[PDB]
Amino acid sequence: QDLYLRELKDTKLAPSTLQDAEGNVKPWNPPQKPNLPELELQGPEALKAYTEQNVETAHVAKESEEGESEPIEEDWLVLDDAEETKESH
Amino acid sequence: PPPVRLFGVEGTYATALYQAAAKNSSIDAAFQSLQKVESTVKKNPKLGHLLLNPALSLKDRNSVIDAIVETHKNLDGYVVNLLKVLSENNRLGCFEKIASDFGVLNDAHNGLLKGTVTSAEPLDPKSFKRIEKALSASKLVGQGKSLKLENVVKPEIKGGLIVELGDKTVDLSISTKIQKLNKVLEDS
C-alpha cells in the first residue's frame, strides 16, 4: 500500500535525521542538542537543589552530650531541693 | 410482500401506488407514466413546479390535475387517481420526491444497485471501467441485477477514493488514513 508505505517512510525518515543521525533538525531553526542533553541535562537539578540535595550531604550528626559530667554541685542542690519538695510533699 | 421500504413519510403514497399497481404488473407502464408526468411538469417548469403550492384551492388543484390529463395521455392507469387523491390530499408539492422514490423502487426491481466511487477529482475511464466490473462480478451484486456507478468530486476529502453501495463501503483514501496517522501518534 503506497499510501501506507510512503506515509510511514516519511513518518520514520523525517525524524530519522533528528534521532538516528545527529544532523540536528533541518526544519527547526532552533537547535535540539543544547536543550535536553546540555542545558536541561542539569534539568532535574535545576528543578531540585544542586550541591546539597543531589550531592545529598552525607553529614555527620552534631554530637550532643550528657550533663557536662558534673554530679556534685548539682546533685547536692537536687537533694536539698528534694528536701524542699518533700516538705511540700 | 412489499419491496424495499420507503419507510413512512410520504413515500407511502409511492409505496401504496406501487404495491396496488404491481398486483397486476403495469408498473413499467405506470412507471413510464410517472416519468412522463414528471417530464411534463419539468417541460412546463413555470407553474408546473410553481403550481404545486398549497394556497390555491381544492377545485383549482383538481383543475390542474385536469390540465395534466388534458395534455394528451400523460396520465395512465392508477396514476391519475393517485393525483386525484394527491390533489385532494394537497400533497402535490412533495410530488418530485414520490417520482424519484418510485424510480428507486423500480430500478431496485431491476436490481440496479447504484454505487459510487467518491474522489476529490474526476478520474480516467480505465479506472472507472476496471472498478465497474470488479463490484459487478463481486459477491456484492449477485448477478441477474445490474450495477451503475458514479464518480463524484469531494473537496472535503483529501483525495484517494471510496467505494459505496448497499450501505456497504470501503475507504482506502488519504484523509481517513492521515486521521488514523494522527490518532496513533496522539498517544504517549
From Swiss-Prot, chain A:
Coiled-coil intervals: none
UniProtKB keywords: ATP synthesis, CF(0), Hydrogen ion transport, Ion transport, Membrane, Mitochondrion, Mitochondrion inner membrane, Transit peptide, Transport
Renumbered residue ranges of the record's region Disordered: 54-89
Biased composition (Acidic residues): 65-89
GO biological process: cristae formation; mitochondrial proton-transporting ATP synthase complex assembly; proton motive force-driven ATP synthesis; proton transmembrane transport
Subcellular location(s) of the protein: Mitochondrion; Mitochondrion inner membrane
One GO CC term, this protein: mitochondrial inner membrane
Extra facts: Present with 6140 molecules/cell in log phase SD medium.
Function of the protein: Mitochondrial membrane ATP synthase (F(1)F(0) ATP synthase or Complex V) produces ATP from ADP in the presence of a proton gradient across the membrane which is generated by electron transport complexes of the respiratory chain. F-type ATPases consist of two structural domains, F(1) - containing the extramembraneous catalytic core and F(0) - containing the membrane proton channel, linked together by a central stalk and a peripheral stalk. During catalysis, ATP synthesis in the catalytic domain of F(1) is coupled via a rotary mechanism of the central stalk subunits to proton translocation.
Quaternary data: F-type ATPases have 2 components, CF(1) - the catalytic core - and CF(0) - the membrane proton channel. In yeast, the dimeric form of ATP synthase consists of 17 polypeptides: alpha, beta, gamma, delta, epsilon, 4 (B), 5 (OSCP), 6 (A), 8, 9 (C), d, E (Tim11), f, g, h, i/j and k.
Family under the similarity heading: Belongs to the ATPase h subunit family.
Protein name per the record: ATP synthase subunit H, mitochondrial
Organism (species): Saccharomyces cerevisiae (strain ATCC 204508 / S288c)
Full-protein residues shown: 36 to 124 of 124
Swiss-Prot record, chain B:
Function: Mitochondrial membrane ATP synthase (F(1)F(0) ATP synthase or Complex V) produces ATP from ADP in the presence of a proton gradient across the membrane which is generated by electron transport complexes of the respiratory chain. F-type ATPases consist of two structural domains, F(1) - containing the extramembraneous catalytic core and F(0) - containing the membrane proton channel, linked together by a central stalk and a peripheral stalk. During catalysis, ATP synthesis in the catalytic domain of F(1) is coupled via a rotary mechanism of the central stalk subunits to proton translocation.
Subunit structure: F-type ATPases have 2 components, CF(1) - the catalytic core - and CF(0) - the membrane proton channel. CF(1) has five subunits: alpha(3), beta(3), gamma(1), delta(1), epsilon(1). CF(0) has three main subunits: a, b and c.
GO biological process, one term: proton motive force-driven mitochondrial ATP synthesis
GO molecular function, one term: proton-transporting ATP synthase activity, rotational mechanism
Main location, first listed in the record: mitochondrion
One cellular component (GO) term of this entry: mitochondrial inner membrane
More about this protein: Present with 32400 molecules/cell in log phase SD medium.
The protein's name: ATP synthase subunit 5, mitochondrial
Localization (cell): Mitochondrion; Mitochondrion inner membrane
Source species of the chain: Saccharomyces cerevisiae (strain ATCC 204508 / S288c) (Baker's yeast)
Gene3D superfamilies: N-terminal domain of the delta subunit of the F1F0-ATP synthase (1.10.520.20)
The gene coding this protein: ATP5
Keywords associated with the record: ATP synthesis, Hydrogen ion transport, Ion transport, Membrane, Mitochondrion, Mitochondrion inner membrane, Transit peptide, Transport
Protein family: Belongs to the ATPase delta chain family.
Pfam family, any one: OSCP
InterPro entries documented for this protein: ATP_synth_OSCP/delta_N_sf, ATPase_OSCP/d_CS, ATPase_OSCP/dsu
Protease in keyword set: no
